[PDB]
Amino acid sequence: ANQALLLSYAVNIVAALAIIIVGLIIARMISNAVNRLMISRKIDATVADFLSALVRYGIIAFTLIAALGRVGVQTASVIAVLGAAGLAVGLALQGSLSNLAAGVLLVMFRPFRAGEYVDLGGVAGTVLSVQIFSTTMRTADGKIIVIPNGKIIAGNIINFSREPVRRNEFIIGVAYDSDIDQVKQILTNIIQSEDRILKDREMTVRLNELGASSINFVVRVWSNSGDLQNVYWDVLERIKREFDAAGISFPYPQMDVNFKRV
Amino acid sequence: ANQALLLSYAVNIVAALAIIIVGLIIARMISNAVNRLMISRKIDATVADFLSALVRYGIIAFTLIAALGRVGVQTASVIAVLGAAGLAVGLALQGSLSNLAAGVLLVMFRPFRAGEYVDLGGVAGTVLSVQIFSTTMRTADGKIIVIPNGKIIAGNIINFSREPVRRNEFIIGVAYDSDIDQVKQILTNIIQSEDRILKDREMTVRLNELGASSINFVVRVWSNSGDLQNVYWDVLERIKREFDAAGISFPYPQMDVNFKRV
Amino acid sequence: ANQALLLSYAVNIVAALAIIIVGLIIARMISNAVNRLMISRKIDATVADFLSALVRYGIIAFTLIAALGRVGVQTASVIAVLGAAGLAVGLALQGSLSNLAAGVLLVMFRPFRAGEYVDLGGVAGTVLSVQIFSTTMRTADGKIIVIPNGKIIAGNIINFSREPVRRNEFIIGVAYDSDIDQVKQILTNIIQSEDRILKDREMTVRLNELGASSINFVVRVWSNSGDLQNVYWDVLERIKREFDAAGISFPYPQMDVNFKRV
Amino acid sequence: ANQALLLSYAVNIVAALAIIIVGLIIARMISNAVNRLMISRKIDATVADFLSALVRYGIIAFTLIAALGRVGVQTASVIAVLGAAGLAVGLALQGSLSNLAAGVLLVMFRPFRAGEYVDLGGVAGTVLSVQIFSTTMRTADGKIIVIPNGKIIAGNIINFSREPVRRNEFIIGVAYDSDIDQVKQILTNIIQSEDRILKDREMTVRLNELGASSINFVVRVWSNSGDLQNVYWDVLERIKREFDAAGISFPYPQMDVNFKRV
Amino acid sequence: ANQALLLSYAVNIVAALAIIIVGLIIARMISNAVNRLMISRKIDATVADFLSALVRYGIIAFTLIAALGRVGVQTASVIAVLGAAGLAVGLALQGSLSNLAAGVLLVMFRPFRAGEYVDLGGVAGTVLSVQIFSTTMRTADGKIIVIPNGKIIAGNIINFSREPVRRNEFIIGVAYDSDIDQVKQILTNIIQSEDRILKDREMTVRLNELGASSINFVVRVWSNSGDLQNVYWDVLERIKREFDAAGISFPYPQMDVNFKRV
Amino acid sequence: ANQALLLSYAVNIVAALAIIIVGLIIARMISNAVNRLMISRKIDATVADFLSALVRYGIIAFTLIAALGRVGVQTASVIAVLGAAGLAVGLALQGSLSNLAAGVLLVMFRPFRAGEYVDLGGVAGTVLSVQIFSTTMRTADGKIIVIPNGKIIAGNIINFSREPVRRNEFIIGVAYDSDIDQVKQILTNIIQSEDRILKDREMTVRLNELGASSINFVVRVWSNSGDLQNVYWDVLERIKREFDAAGISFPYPQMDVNFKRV
Amino acid sequence: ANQALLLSYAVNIVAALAIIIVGLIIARMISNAVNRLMISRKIDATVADFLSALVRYGIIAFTLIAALGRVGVQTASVIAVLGAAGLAVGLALQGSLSNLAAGVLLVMFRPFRAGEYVDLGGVAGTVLSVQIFSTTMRTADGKIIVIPNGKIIAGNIINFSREPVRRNEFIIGVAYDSDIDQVKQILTNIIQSEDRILKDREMTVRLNELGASSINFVVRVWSNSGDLQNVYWDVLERIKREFDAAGISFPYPQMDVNFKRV
């Protein structure tokens, strides 16, 4: 009998569907325009994508509110349900968002770059790449370590490769009866005859400690980062050979034994 | 007397029940359509299920609000009660949601896969499977370790099997009076005569440390991941045999005893 | 004089009491129906009880709002007071809810079951039962340890009994002058003559380490979980007896003493 | 002149005071009735008191809202001020509420009871009582330790007294030249001649470890909880006496000294 | 021209000032009355002060809302601004509130009192006083330690002075060739001849451990708390003197040296 | 044509600017008056500044709401935007606010003062000043340590300088064959002949431990805080000299060597 | 037919676009004016930028609300969507905001400055610069460490370079038979003959400890920060030379061996 009400309900459903379609199209267009505008301003691609996604989902939320109000759902109900859904999605994506922001910061400020040897909170290796959510490094023995970006930015970043010049330290323990001046001059000759040691830097050769069984000399010399390990090995071998040749003894653990027979 | 009011109450209850039924049916249909649409777009099954569940429960919330408003419950009351119930359910399911998102991320980005040996925050073993809420690994001695996914993604992932080539390290301590060149050449011959050691990689044989009782040589060689342990064992046995044959002594702990009798 | 107002107040109080009674009855009936429906769908009893309790308390909240509005208390006041009470109850029951959800997950996914020996975050023992809020285990020496379920699911679960086959490891230190081939062949004969050692598994007998006073051999063999400890004991005793018979010496801590008398 | 307004203000103040008095009386009566109802249902006294306090304070909040609305204070203002006050009180009482819930759980599920020796997160002692907010234990040396209930339920509970039977473990180190069979048979005779050792339980006597200076035998026997320490002491003394009588030597730390005079 | 509007604005300002004054006076009076009522009910002074401060500030908030509404500021604006200010003050005072509640609990339940020696989470000393926010203790060497109350109640409280009787433990290591019965009887005579040792308590004198160089005897005796240290010192001195007199040797670290000359 | 609307818009903008100016002036005046009132009540300057800033910013918020409502911005929009801005500022200033409150508490209660030597959570030094956000101390070797105030109040405060009298402890290890009475009397004479040791305090000289190589005596004496280190040094030197004079031997690490030649 | 409605919709869209443009322009102008005003008041540039960004985004939010209300979107919907977007952005930028505030505090209060050697929570090095989100330091061996500002301000800051004068400490262990007065006078002569040691500061030379094998003397002297290490090295070398010349012996680890042959 009352055919007007059924027609009104049908036209309301059709209007809601039309609103949904038009709103989705408008959201896509506006989000794409905003993304292109942000990219043209040299803003980072990840940040632009995040902001454009926010814009698109906001416009879609407006469209959903309008359509559901058309089919009789109140604005407060739609807002509450969308808020609950967004809270659930945000709880699911909180860690991913933290890692995403951290990766953006890592790429932007470059505390380390690919190819550099770093120590990221107890693990050390050569950086391979900083991905969207985590950074991959390869250790000296060939292991692959994947570290989330947020964990990296939250802690200390120790970069071994950033400075072109680094320092070697030698701790040489010789017998107490060794001549101090002879040890000093032999070590000084060894480090002066080495061309890869920078002569304009610190060249410390000092007696450092009176140990339990030996007197320890400290040698601190600087070299280019690509020569540090080779310099250490060569200087150590030369120290061994020249101390053996000069009679300077590397002492075994000492022990004064007071003999008492009962 | 006033039979109109009772009939109105009955028809309101019937209308509420009809709204509940129709809303449940519509929620099921729309959730299934959205799930099929997301699956057809190659979106992950778990993500599609989560989003479809959100859509279905949102439509059910709309239906409940409508029906309870029909039976006289105000919209604000329904929103508050549904919010309290959803907050309780979310508190119950927070950890499960975190593990679910972490497992989705693990499957999507594949920091490790089944069959690879990994170290996940202090526990090492072969990955068996990444399940919905946790990952199962079997240790080298046969234990089964179950680790929640969120704990895995929150920490470092060390992958032992990702790189096809890995490095062995040998620390050999010989007596101080040993000839350095003889030790170097014997170790070099041992590592050159081994076919499983990659000759195009690093083949370091250097004197590394002047220890308390011995001078330590470091040997670093690379091999395919499937040959690393066998290479280590064979090279160690050959080092022992050839050092015994050549007279190079592995020294016991040394002690210089200064004898004093009172 | 104005007897109408007092009668109106009395009838409002009576209406509020009737609303309270009817709402309690309806809440009980609907909660029971929902619980039976969820149980008939093979849903877990604990989850069904939790959801039915939520439904019942929501209906009771609706009834309280209606009755208090009848006696003149505003809807916002009732919502705020019920929210404060629910927040207090939720603060009291947060840990219990976490443990309840964790126990449901433990029973559903079964990382361990009753009778299995597990290590749950530093404590090891045989699982007795997973209760509603905590899991009880008995240690090897007879202690009873009660661990909350949330603590269990939040950490690593190491299961000793899940795999039917497990591995034994032997570290045997022999004197440096021992013949490597003789040690290898004696250990190989010992592990081949043992029937409980699985011959289709790994049977590693290798020289593993050049220690301070001894050379260490590693023996890794597999056995059924019920034979692991007995195999370890029998193999160790046989190793001792056969090394004593063959003259292979287990060395005491060594010390090279360089005697110097002043 | 306008005496009507002053009379209206006075009557509003009087009405507010009457509302306050009546609401306090009604809150007390309803809270007491609810408390008696919950007690008659065998519900725990602490839970009943907590819920009755919530009911009473909710009714008092309703009364305050009504009275302050009578004297012209808006409902939103009263709700906001009461919410701020309740938030402050809840911040003050959060830890006490956590301890109260934990104590209720401890009394309800009884992981330990008064008189039992337990280890509660690193501290061990005999439980004296579980109070409303904390549990008191007395250590073996007479100290009194007070532990909050929430800390107890949040961690592992190790109960030493729950099982009627517990296990002793003996690690006996004998000289390498000792006869294995003689040691095994002497230990077996010692543990068989002890009546307090349960013969239907495990009676392990095995060689367990090849130590640096001794070979270690493990003896594991079970006894009633009240006899464990006495059994340990008696068995240890018998082991000492019988090993001395049989010539089995408990070895001092060994040292192979290779004498070299320069 | 329009002098009515200016007069209305002036009278609104005057009305707001009058409301402010009257509300402050009423808040003071009601807060004082509530404080006196709570004190007369034997409620703790600190709790009464806290609750009275809450009441006074709530009444002041009502007065501010009324006055600012008089001068045209909307109720929602006043509520939001007061909420922001209260949130800032609460953030500033959160730790102080926690310490205040903890101090109230400490005074109420008295886990320790002034003059008792306690160990509060790793620091031990004699309690001087429990103040409003922290507790002061003096260590054995005279240091003053101030510990916040919340930190105290959140952790274990070890009370050394609560029990009137405490236990001493002696670990005496004697040579392996010592007669067990003679050692036991000498220690038993020493502890029986001491009057300050409670003879109705445990008087354990047992062989406890077969150490590396000595056999260890455990002596556990009880005494009044004021005699524990003196008993320990006297018993130790008597043990030394009587073991010296009886020939029982306290052994130096032992070493079996196997002499080998190459 | 319609010049009335443009004039209305201009007059609304002018009214908004006038409201902004008048509100800023009123906020400044009222904040200054409140600050002077709080200062005149001897309230701490920092607390008065904080509260006056809150008052001023609240009045400015009221003014902004009024002006933006004048130019057509709704009250809810202004409240939401100001809330977002305040939340951002509060997130930025949370740690600073915590440190500010902690510094106020430190100055008010004075657990330490400038010039006193304290240990603040593992770092020890002389307090220089308590600033607004952090406290500066100078260590014994001249380092400057800056510690945030919140970290200081959250942890234990150990004050070395608060008590005028402190205790020294001496642990003297003598040979086992030393006469106990002679050692006791020599130490007693040393501590009695020292005038800076308080004779009305504890003067403990007891045998404390039977060590591995020596018997340890404990000496505990009290002195004024300014004499503690000098007393320790003088007493130690006197102990050395008098033990050397009396023949009491400070023993070297002992070792019983059981010689066995194979 | 109804061309009025379409024209109205078009004019509403045009009005919304005009509102957007005008609001963006006004936001830029007002934000720039506020930024210039804050800069002219000597306020920090970073704080001014943060506050100006807040002002600009608030005005943009007002403009968006107005325009979307023009095109029919309700104010509550716009507020909710903008709140969700702002919450997401704040979650992304929380750590960056914390680091920004911490860097502002570091620059403002200057606990350390560029060129000073500091220890920031376990890592020590020379400060290079305090950037917007992190601080860069170079270690003594040339490594580069990047530390987030929030981590720096949350922990202790140890400044090695702030004080112009610092203290050296020498622990010299000599043989027990050494003359105490001779050692004291030799050390005193060494430290008096050193010109870089401040004679107006502490010059402690005392016997500090009776060690296991030696008696330890403590020497504490002060010097300018630029001379500390050189003074330490020179004084140590002089101590060695003069003790060798005077016959004072640096003792090897001592051992009293009680010889027993069985």
Beta bridge partners of G146: A157, G136
Beta bridge partners of A125: A118
Closest CA to A12 of A68, A82, A81: A68
d(CA G142, CA F258): 53
- Structure tokens given for G249: 């012996």
- Structure tokens given for A213: 């069984």
d(CA E65, CA E58): 11
CB nearest B101 (choices: A84, A92, A144): A92
What class, spelled out in words, does domain G117-159 have in CATH?
mainly beta
d(CA A46, CA A25): 23
DSSP string, C44-75: -HHHHHHHHHHHHHHHHHHHHHHHHHHTT--H
- Structure tokens given for F230: 């000098």
Closest CA to C138 of F245, D163, B231: D163
Between strands A123-130 and E144-148, the pairing is unpaired
Closest CA to E95 of D12, D13, F240, F95: F95
Beta strands in chain B (DSSP E): 117-120, 123-130, 134-138, 144-148, 157-159, 165-174, 203-210, 215-224, 254-261
Beta strands in chain F (DSSP E): 117-120, 123-130, 134-138, 144-148, 157-159, 165-174, 203-210, 215-224, 254-261
Beta strands in B189-251 (DSSP E): 203-210, 215-224
Mutant choice from G143, G174, G176 vs A, greatest count of A C-beta within 10 A: G143
d(CA A161, CA G141): 12
Altogether, the residues listed in chain E come to a count of 262
d(CA G225, CA G231): 10
* Ramachandran angles phi, psi of B223, nearest 5°: -155, 165
CB nearest C142 (choices: D163, D176, D209): D163
E255 to chain F, closest Cα gap in Å: 5
CB nearest B163 (choices: A123, A144, A253): A144
Query: Residue G57: what residue type?
Result: Y
Closest CA to F213 of B26, E253, B197, G174: E253
d(CA F22, CA F10): 18
Residue D225 DSSP code: G
| C-alpha distance from residue D236 to each of D54, D218, D233, E210 (Å) | 61, 12, 5, 9
Q: Please state how this structure was obtained.
A: cryo-EM
d(CA E134, CA E150): 8
Q: Taking CB atoms and an 8 Å limit, are E210 and D173 in contact across chains? A: yes
- Structure tokens given for F13: 């903008």
- Structure tokens given for E129: 């006083």
- D3 burial class (0-12, 13-18, 19+ CB within 10 angstroms)? exposed
Domain extent listing, chain C = 3-109, 117-159, 165-246
Q: How many CA atoms lie within 13 A of D34 on its CB side?
A: 17
CB atoms within 10 A of CB G125: 21
DSSP string, F137-188: EE-TTS-EEEEEHHHHHHS-EEESSSSSEEEEEEEEEE-TTS-HHHHHHHHH
Residue C245 DSSP code: H
Q: Which helix H or strand E contains E80, and what residues bound it?
A: helix E75-109
Closest CA to B224 of B176, B141, B165: B165
Mutant choice from B81, B89, B113, B162 vs A, greatest count of A C-beta within 10 A: B162
| C-alpha distance from residue A24 to each of A12, A62, A67 (Å) | 18, 10, 12
Q: If you measure CA to CA, which chain E residue comes closest to F109?
A: E133
Count H helices and E strands in chain D, helices first.
Answer: 6, 9
| C-alpha distance from residue B47 to each of A119, B39, B131, D90, G1 (Å) | 35, 9, 14, 38, 48
Rg of chain B, C-alpha, whole Å: 35
Place of tokens 């053996």: A244
Query: Residue B237: what residue type?
Result: E
Query: Are the C-beta atoms of residues A128 and A138 closer than 8 Å to each other?
Result: yes
**Phi-psi bin for D42: left (phi > 0), alpha (psi -120 to 50), beta?**
left
d(CA E122, CA A138): 42
Closest CA to A222 of A165, A160, A162: A165
d(CA F173, CA G127): 47
Mutant choice from F91, F96, F119, F162 vs E, greatest count of E C-beta within 10 A: F162
d(CA A212, CA D201): 54
* Ramachandran angles phi, psi of F127, nearest 5°: -70, 130
Q: Chains that contact G by 3+ CB pairs under 8 Å? A: A, F
CB nearest C141 (choices: D97, D109, D166): D166
Place of tokens 């010496």: C249
Three state DSSP letters for chain A: CCHHHHHHHHHHHHHHHHHHHHHHHHHHHHHHHHHHHHHHCCCCHHHHHHHHHHHHHHHHHHHHHHHHHHCCCCHHHHHHHHHHHHHHHHHHHHHHHHHHHHHHHHHHHCCCCCCCEEEECCEEEEEEEECCCEEEEECCCCCEEEEEHHHHHHCCEEECCCCCEEEEEEEEEECCCCCHHHHHHHHHHHHHCCCCCCCCCCEEEEEEEECCCCEEEEEEEEEEHHHHHHHHHHHHHHHHHHHHHHCCCCCCCEEEEEEEEC
Q: Which residues contact G225 (CB under 8 A, 6 or more apart)?
A: G160, G161, G163, G164, G165, G166
Q: Is the dihedral of CA E76, E82, E88, E94 positive or negative?
A: negative
d(CA C188, CA C197): 12
Contact F/B (≥3 CB pairs under 8 Å): no
Q: DSSP alpha helices (H): ranges in G71-220?
A: 75-109, 149-154, 180-192
Q: If you measure CA to CA, which chain E residue comes closest to D237?
A: E207
User: Residues 96 to 135 of F: which have CB under 8 A from any G CB?
Assistant: 96, 123, 131, 133-134
DSSP string, D33-97: HHHHHHHHTT--HHHHHHHHHHHHHHHHHHHHHHHHHHTT--HHHHHHHHHHHHHHHHHHHHHHH
CA G251 to chain centre: 43
F86 to chain E, closest Cα gap in Å: 8
- A3 burial class (0-12, 13-18, 19+ CB within 10 angstroms)? exposed
Confirm or reject contact between D80 and chain E (CB < 8 A): yes
Closest CA to G68 of F64, A13, A26, A84: A26
Confirm or reject contact between G54 and chain F (CB < 8 A): yes
For residue D81, list chain E residues with Cβ-Cβ distance below 8 A: 58, 61-62
State whether residue D122 is helix, strand or coil. Answer: coil
| C-alpha distance from residue B61 to each of A76, A126, B36, C169, E6 (Å) | 12, 52, 22, 60, 54
Q: Taking CB atoms and an 8 Å limit, are B88 and C105 in contact across chains? A: no
Beta strands in C27-183 (DSSP E): 117-120, 123-130, 134-138, 144-148, 157-159, 165-174
d(CA B260, CA C262): 7
Mutant choice from D51, D104, D135, D210 vs C, greatest count of C C-beta within 10 A: D210
CB atoms within 10 A of CB A183: 20
- Structure tokens given for F63: 């003014």
**Phi-psi bin for G101: left (phi > 0), alpha (psi -120 to 50), beta?**
alpha
d(CA B214, CA B209): 9
For residue E260, list chain F residues with Cβ-Cβ distance below 8 A: 262
Place of tokens 């040996």: B117
**Through-space distance between the first and last CA atoms of chain G, rounded to whole angstroms:** 126
Q: Which helix H or strand E contains B228, and what residues bound it?
A: helix B228-246
CA G67 to chain centre: 46
Query: Residue G26: what residue type?
Result: I
Q: If you measure CA to CA, which chain D residue comes closest to C241?
A: D180
Query: Are the C-beta atoms of residues D99 and D134 closer than 8 Å to each other?
Result: yes
d(CA A201, CA G141): 12
* Ramachandran angles phi, psi of E19, nearest 5°: -60, -40
Q: Taking CB atoms and an 8 Å limit, are F111 and E146 in contact across chains? A: yes
Query: Residue A256: what residue type?
Result: D
* Neighbour-count burial for B129-159, b at 16+ CB within 10 Å, e otherwise: ebeebbbbbbbeebbbbbbbbbbbbbbbbbb
Q: Which residues contact E203 (CB under 8 A, 6 or more apart)?
A: E188, E191, E192, E197, E220, E221
Query: Are the C-beta atoms of residues F112 and F157 closer than 8 Å to each other?
Result: yes
E151 to chain F, closest Cα gap in Å: 8
CA A260 to chain centre: 62
Query: Are the C-beta atoms of residues F205 and F187 closer than 8 Å to each other?
Result: yes
Q: Which residues contact G195 (CB under 8 A, 6 or more apart)?
A: none
d(CA E81, CA G39): 28
Closest CA to B143 of C147, C164, C137: C164
Query: Residue B145: what residue type?
Result: I
Residue C251 DSSP code: P
For residue C72, list chain D residues with Cβ-Cβ distance below 8 A: 66
d(CA B220, CA B172): 11
State whether residue F119 is helix, strand or coil. Answer: strand
* Neighbour-count burial for G76-111, b at 16+ CB within 10 Å, e otherwise: ebbbbbbebbbebeeebeebbbbbbbbbbbbeeeeb
d(CA E189, CA E242): 10
Beta bridge partners of D219: D170, D205
- Structure tokens given for B72: 């006289």
Q: After which residues is chain C broken (C to N over 2.5 A)?
A: none
d(CA C225, CA C261): 59
Q: Which residues contact G2 (CB under 8 A, 6 or more apart)?
A: none
Q: Which helix H or strand E contains F69, and what residues bound it?
A: helix F45-70
G41 to chain A, closest Cα gap in Å: 31
Query: Are the C-beta atoms of residues B147 and B133 closer than 8 Å to each other?
Result: no
CA C61 to chain centre: 37
Question: Could you tell me what percentage of chain C is helix, strand and coil, using 3-state DSSP and rounding each to the nearest 5?
Answer: 55, 25, 25
Q: After which residues is chain B broken (C to N over 2.5 A)?
A: none
User: Residues 198 to 257 of B: which have CB under 8 A from any A CB?
Assistant: 206-210, 212-213, 215, 222, 253-257
C240 to chain B, closest Cα gap in Å: 23
d(CA A215, CA E43): 71
Closest CA to D244 of D195, D172, D188: D172
* Resolution of the solved structure (Å): 2.7
Q: Which residues contact A178 (CB under 8 A, 6 or more apart)?
A: A215, A248, A249
| C-alpha distance from residue F34 to each of F56, F68, G86 (Å) | 10, 27, 35
Confirm or reject contact between C29 and chain B (CB < 8 A): no
d(CA C210, CA B219): 15
- Structure tokens given for C30: 């609907």
Between strands F123-130 and A165-174, the pairing is unpaired
Confirm or reject contact between A77 and chain G (CB < 8 A): no
Beta bridge partners of E16: none
State whether residue D236 is helix, strand or coil. Answer: helix
d(CA G220, CA G169): 5
Confirm or reject contact between G79 and chain F (CB < 8 A): yes
- Structure tokens given for D71: 């004297």
d(CA F78, CA F60): 12
Altogether, the residues listed in chain G come to a count of 262
Q: If you measure CA to CA, which chain B residue comes closest to C94?
A: B91
d(CA A60, CA B107): 29
Between strands F144-148 and G254-261, the pairing is unpaired
Which CATH number is associated with domain G3-109?
Answer: 1.10.287.1260
What's the topology of domain D165-246? Answer: Alpha-Beta Plaits (3.30.70)
CB atoms within 10 A of CB A124: 15
State whether residue B125 is helix, strand or coil. Answer: strand
CB atoms within 10 A of CB E155: 16
d(CA G14, CA G71): 9
Closest CA to G233 of B237, A184, E202, A27: A184
Q: Taking CB atoms and an 8 Å limit, are F210 and E142 in contact across chains? A: no
Q: Taking CB atoms and an 8 Å limit, are C66 and B73 in contact across chains? A: yes
Rg of chain E, C-alpha, whole Å: 35
